[PDB]
Amino acid sequence: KVIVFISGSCLFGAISRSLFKKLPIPYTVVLLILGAILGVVASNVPLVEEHTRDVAHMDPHVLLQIFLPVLIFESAFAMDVHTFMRSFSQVCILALFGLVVASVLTAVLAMNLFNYNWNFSEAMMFGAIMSATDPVAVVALLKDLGASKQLGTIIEGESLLNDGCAIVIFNVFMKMVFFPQLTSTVGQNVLYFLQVAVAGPLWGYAVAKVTVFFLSHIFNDALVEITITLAATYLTYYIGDIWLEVSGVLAVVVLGLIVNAEKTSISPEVEVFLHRFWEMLAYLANTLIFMMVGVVVTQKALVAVDKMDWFYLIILYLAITIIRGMVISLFSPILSRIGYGLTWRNAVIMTWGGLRGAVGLALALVVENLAGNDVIGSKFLFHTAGIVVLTLVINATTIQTLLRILGMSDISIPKRLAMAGAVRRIHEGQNRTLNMLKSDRFLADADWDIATAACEISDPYSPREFADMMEEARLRMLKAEKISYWKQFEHGMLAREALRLLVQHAEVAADEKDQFILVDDLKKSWQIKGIYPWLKRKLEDLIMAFEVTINIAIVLNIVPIIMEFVEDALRISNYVFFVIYAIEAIVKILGLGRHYIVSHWNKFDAFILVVALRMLRLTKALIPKLILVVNGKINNQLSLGYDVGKGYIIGEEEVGKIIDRMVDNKKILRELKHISETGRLQVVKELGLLQREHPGIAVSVKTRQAIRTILNHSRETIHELQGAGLLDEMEAHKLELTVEIKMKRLMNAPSSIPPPPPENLLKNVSWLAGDMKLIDFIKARASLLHFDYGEVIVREGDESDGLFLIVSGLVKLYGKEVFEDYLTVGNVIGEMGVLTKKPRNATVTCETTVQVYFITAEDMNIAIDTFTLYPSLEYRLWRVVAIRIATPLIMEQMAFQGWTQEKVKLHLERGYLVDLAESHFQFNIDATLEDVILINGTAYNAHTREEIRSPCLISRTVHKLTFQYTATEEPRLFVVRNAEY
């Protein structure tokens, strides 16, 4: 019956796809040709005639209900959603206007020239059936050799919208023509138009949001989400099919776009499985419909032969080609003026990009089968088969020729240079490892000709002098900046979108002109000036159990509206609404203790309750949702702008220190350094102004990039640990799943701005001995002094003024060999100036804006006199300065070799100070104390009578020590007991 035909069709499609892969002509036309052969065999042998008659004469219902929604759903599934949304406005405008112009022009051309006794509706149906297209072949060719990304997305989106509008027009006009028993008045026609406009896509959006919310609560389960997605898609299609014969495909398209847009709630395995499954179904449908078209056209059009239609076909193709070119040629200056400009290469490649696919053949089969025994169906089928089999080869050959000639698919010089360098590096490394392997003991009598020929690799590709030198120098500088950007991305310091924005900004201004870097485009990239801030300014300035119950009651009030739009239950529903109003009155009575005297907005709700249509109650809960989503929407773009600004700054800083060695001409080097430093200084001030506008964006981006850097380095560490054999494959995978989970949780990070860190709470918590004395010191010291870049607070050798503790920022200390230290938030500086009364010994500078608290010598004396009986703050300060002095001289010792900063920090935390007054300035060293450090003073050995002074390390050989008490130098020691105690 039908089995052998389908199996043979699949085998023929497979062999045709495998054979004609190399030729630029798409495979599908071969299928059509093969179908033609079957026709001239179906007229003689009764067996193939029986098989074809059983299969090729199916009902239109199955075609119109199955073959088209699958194809349009596939055309609306494989597209990149974000790239589509980047140009949705121009794509929609161009697609709609091209569709309407092409349809009306084809209709009037047919009526004027064909000399057929047709009506206007037949010609409009002809135009609609000649308007639809399919871009899978041209986008496949572009993927193969076009070397472009945005062009295919533009073509796919335009084709999708064109197909949707074309099938809408064809369905309405076919229903008007072939069923001449329906009223065509305006009152229901406008209702039908608005229904198809608004009711369908909103229903698809609602079901998509519902199923996404359902899938959000599913963890590490793969079958459930696949089955739920398939069932939801079929349910949407079935409700659309019950509703109309048109809006179902629109609802399916919207649902597919929304599902493809979301990525956080669906694991990638499900997405790739769904892509593969839907692609397989679409390919099968396309092959079957092509073979059916071929066999039916060969069996039918042999009795409709004339020279007039053969003359008509060529001029029809010429007319549709010229109008398709002319509409976009006329609309190009408007697009250039509005800002969505496109190059003339894009226009000339768009002119030939219209390839007819399978939608037109489907509609032709439907309109031929519904025509009965009439010549109109044969004319339709023959003309559409002729035009598709003409364009499918001619347009493909011409687009390949134009893509070759225009040279946009040309490998640039840096691409070839980088590929050659990479190939040379790989070959050198392989030669080195071969040389190492040849020296191995067990690698003897291995034929090295086979080994060398097996692993060989190769690339797939194979004042004028001053101006040329400047041009090549700036090209090399652009190359260095690009590789710096890629290095920064690979180390993890950047996000994804900022990286591609920087790369494309560098590329579009690389070889266009002499200027290479611009700042105002970056300015508009990070700042927001569109309609969103104006909408926010208008919106936010012009305007739980009880709320949930009120919302549920308002939703329940739609059921009387449903009945009204369509009894005892309805009266009971009105009584329930009155009871809900009474419950609202009871809620007001309960809130009378808070506020019930008068209200402004609630008068409308009171009037609505007096009427009892309760949709006005839900807008109070709807108000926070709009601000909640728009604040995140603007903050995401603001964070991306700050990120790309920081990336440009750090890239310029990295490339600044290498340009001097690259060139040797003085004038070029000077002018390049001048323009680079002016650009950096111009952008850094605006970045600082953006930071000063609000501080939460910087905090968010720093705390969202530190996690990325830490996770990347942990992944590198675990890969290295796997490479050393200390753990096997399964444990490594089990541990790496945790890293993947951490990254997945980081993906949906709270991009909403975290509150700024507290001032008093962090002051009390960060210091160990937080008490009421700290509060008294804060009340006696409120400076919050701010120092910007390029300022030095104190200098070495200057007289001591007091103690300074930092509350915001990072500072760098240079002291004396020499050392460099970095103090973060919560550090205390100026310590020995109040204890040992030393003027100064080191210089501290600030690399950014810092907020600090100032304590003077008088303030320090007042603080010291504030607590005297139990100076816990003073004792903690003594411990802090003691461990600060003792820390750097222990890790460098040979005894503590192989110890990190945290190891020596946590080793010495369990140590105290020695009371020299109780011990009468005499100490005995035993094995109980693990470490003894001379903090201050001069110590005299009780055995060797040797005098030593701080900074020094007491050896384990010394057992008894004596100290001399002096007012100007009081001896101090730190003792850490053994870890076994």
Residue ranges of the annotated binding site for 3',5'-cyclic AMP are 830, 832-833, 840-841
Closest approach of Cβ 847 to ligand CMP, in Å?
16
- Tell me if 897 contacts its own copies by CB under 8 A: no
Determine the Cα–Cα distance for residues 20 and 18; give it in Å rounded to an integer: 6
Give the residue, chosen from 583, 698, 828, 948, that forms a contact with its own copies under the rule CB under 8 A.
Answer: 698
CB 102 within 8 A of CB 324: yes
Q: What does residue 516 show for φ and ψ, rounded to 5 degrees?
A: -125, -35
- Tell me if 268 contacts its own copies by CB under 8 A: no
Tokens coding 440? 């191995």
- Tell me if 936 contacts ligand CMP by CB under 6 A: no
Determine the Cα–Cα distance for residues 317 and 392; give it in Å rounded to an integer: 12
Task: Tell which residue, 239, 193, 232, has the closest CA to residue 214.
Answer: 232
Picked from ligand CMP, its own copies, none, the partner binding residue 841 (CB below 5 to 8 A depending on kind) is ligand CMP
- Tell me if 843 contacts ligand CMP by CB under 6 A: no
Determine the Cα–Cα distance for residues 470 and 676; give it in Å rounded to an integer: 15
Looking at residues 564 to 603 of the shown chain, list those that interact with its own copies (rule: CB under 8 A).
Answer: none
Please give the single-letter amino acid code of residue 688: G
- Tell me if 57 contacts ligand CMP by CB under 6 A: no
Q: What value does the CA radius of gyration of the chain take, rounded to a whole number of Å?
A: 40
Tokens coding 850? 């810092």
Give the residue, chosen from 144, 677, 731, 798, that forms a contact with its own copies under the rule CB under 8 A.
Answer: 731
- Tell me if 685 contacts its own copies by CB under 8 A: no
- Tell me if 413 contacts its own copies by CB under 8 A: no
| Nearest to its own copies of 891, 914 (CB atom) | 891
Give the residue, chosen from 185, 462, 515, 824, that forms a contact with its own copies under the rule CB under 8 A.
Answer: 824
H helix runs in 57-149, sequence order: 60-62, 68-75, 81-85, 88-113, 120-131, 136-141
- Tell me if 830 contacts ligand CMP by CB under 6 A: yes
Strand ranges across the sheet with 792-794: 792-794, 842-846, 811-815, 819-823
CB 960 within 8 A of CB 923: yes
Determine the Cα–Cα distance for residues 379 and 722; give it in Å rounded to an integer: 70
Picked from ligand CMP, its own copies, none, the partner binding residue 832 (CB below 5 to 8 A depending on kind) is ligand CMP
Residue 821: helix, strand or coil by DSSP? strand
> For 315, left (φ over 0), alpha (ψ -120 to 50), or beta?
alpha
- Tell me if 477 contacts ligand CMP by CB under 6 A: no
Picked from ligand CMP, its own copies, none, the partner binding residue 402 (CB below 5 to 8 A depending on kind) is none
Residue 218: helix, strand or coil by DSSP? coil
Determine the Cα–Cα distance for residues 858 and 860; give it in Å rounded to an integer: 5
Looking at residues 910 to 939 of the shown chain, list those that interact with its own copies (rule: CB under 8 A).
Answer: none
- Tell me if 48 contacts its own copies by CB under 8 A: no
- Tell me if 520 contacts its own copies by CB under 8 A: no
- Tell me if 903 contacts ligand CMP by CB under 6 A: no
Closest approach of Cβ 21 to its own copies, in Å?
8
Determine the Cα–Cα distance for residues 367 and 380; give it in Å rounded to an integer: 8
Closest approach of Cβ 588 to its own copies, in Å?
40
Picked from ligand CMP, its own copies, none, the partner binding residue 840 (CB below 5 to 8 A depending on kind) is ligand CMP
Determine the Cα–Cα distance for residues 941 and 947; give it in Å rounded to an integer: 7
CB 934 within 8 A of CB 954: yes
- Tell me if 92 contacts its own copies by CB under 8 A: no
Closest approach of Cβ 438 to ligand CMP, in Å?
15
- Tell me if 748 contacts its own copies by CB under 8 A: no
Residues in the chain that come right before a backbone break, where C and next N are over 2.5 Å apart: 462, 543, 566, 612, 816
From the list 2-10, 578-586, 723-731, 829-837, the region that binds ligand CMP by CB under 6 A is 829-837
Please give the single-letter amino acid code of residue 85: M
Q: What does residue 771 show for φ and ψ, rounded to 5 degrees?
A: -155, -170
Picked from its own copies, ligand CMP, none, the partner binding residue 800 (CB below 5 to 8 A depending on kind) is ligand CMP
Host H or E run for residue 935 = strand 929-936
- Tell me if 276 contacts its own copies by CB under 8 A: yes
Determine the Cα–Cα distance for residues 627 and 624; give it in Å rounded to an integer: 6
Determine the Cα–Cα distance for residues 320 and 902; give it in Å rounded to an integer: 76
Length in residues, the chain = 981
CB 807 within 8 A of CB 762: yes
Closest approach of Cβ 808 to its own copies, in Å?
6
- Tell me if 422 contacts its own copies by CB under 8 A: yes
Give the residue, chosen from 61, 884, 903, 949, that forms a contact with ligand CMP under the rule CB under 6 A.
Answer: 884
CB 704 within 8 A of CB 746: yes
Determine the Cα–Cα distance for residues 385 and 159; give it in Å rounded to an integer: 20
Looking at residues 807 to 826 of the shown chain, list those that interact with ligand CMP (rule: CB under 6 A).
Answer: 813, 815, 821
Q: Closest CB to ligand CMP belongs to which residue?
A: 833
From the list 336-344, 666-674, 701-709, 837-845, the region that binds ligand CMP by CB under 6 A is 837-845
CB atoms within 10 A of CB 63: 17
Please give the single-letter amino acid code of residue 478: L
- Tell me if 797 contacts ligand CMP by CB under 6 A: no
H helix runs in 441-530, sequence order: 448-454, 464-491, 497-508, 520-526
- Tell me if 235 contacts its own copies by CB under 8 A: yes
Give the residue, chosen from 19, 280, 394, 889, that forms a contact with its own copies under the rule CB under 8 A.
Answer: 280
Q: Exposed, middle or buried by CB within 10 Å (0-12, 13-18, 19+), for 970?
A: middle
Picked from ligand CMP, its own copies, none, the partner binding residue 831 (CB below 5 to 8 A depending on kind) is ligand CMP
- Tell me if 831 contacts ligand CMP by CB under 6 A: yes
Residue ranges of the annotated binding site for 3',5'-cyclic GMP are 830-832, 840-841
CB 811 within 8 A of CB 850: yes
Looking at residues 803 to 822 of the shown chain, list those that interact with its own copies (rule: CB under 8 A).
Answer: 808-810, 822
From the list 427-435, 517-525, 580-588, 828-836, the region that binds its own copies by CB under 8 A is 427-435
- Tell me if 840 contacts ligand CMP by CB under 6 A: yes
Give the residue, chosen from 339, 593, 723, 790, that forms a contact with its own copies under the rule CB under 8 A.
Answer: 723
From the list 28-36, 191-199, 441-449, 664-672, the region that binds its own copies by CB under 8 A is 441-449
Picked from its own copies, ligand CMP, none, the partner binding residue 222 (CB below 5 to 8 A depending on kind) is its own copies
Give the residue, chosen from 439, 868, 955, 968, that forms a contact with its own copies under the rule CB under 8 A.
Answer: 439
Determine the Cα–Cα distance for residues 287 and 12; give it in Å rounded to an integer: 9
Give the residue, chosen from 409, 412, 717, 919, that forms a contact with its own copies under the rule CB under 8 A.
Answer: 717
Determine the Cα–Cα distance for residues 206 and 608; give it in Å rounded to an integer: 28
- Tell me if 888 contacts ligand CMP by CB under 6 A: yes
CB atoms within 10 A of CB 772: 8
Residue 254: helix, strand or coil by DSSP? helix
Task: Tell which residue, 753, 752, 648, has the closest CA to residue 695.
Answer: 753
- Tell me if 800 contacts ligand CMP by CB under 6 A: yes
Please give the single-letter amino acid code of residue 673: K
- Tell me if 951 contacts ligand CMP by CB under 6 A: no
From the list 167-175, 459-467, 717-725, 838-846, the region that binds ligand CMP by CB under 6 A is 838-846
Looking at residues 455 to 494 of the shown chain, list those that interact with its own copies (rule: CB under 8 A).
Answer: 455, 457, 460, 483-490
Closest approach of Cβ 920 to ligand CMP, in Å?
29
Closest approach of Cβ 416 to its own copies, in Å?
11
| Nearest to ligand CMP of 776, 831 (CB atom) | 831
Asked if the peptide bond before residue 46 counts as cis, ω within 30 degrees of 0, the response is no
Closest approach of Cβ 840 to its own copies, in Å?
23
Picked from its own copies, ligand CMP, none, the partner binding residue 900 (CB below 5 to 8 A depending on kind) is its own copies
Residues forming contacts to ligand CMP in the complex (CB under 6 A) are: 800, 813, 815, 821, 829-833, 838, 840-842, 884, 888
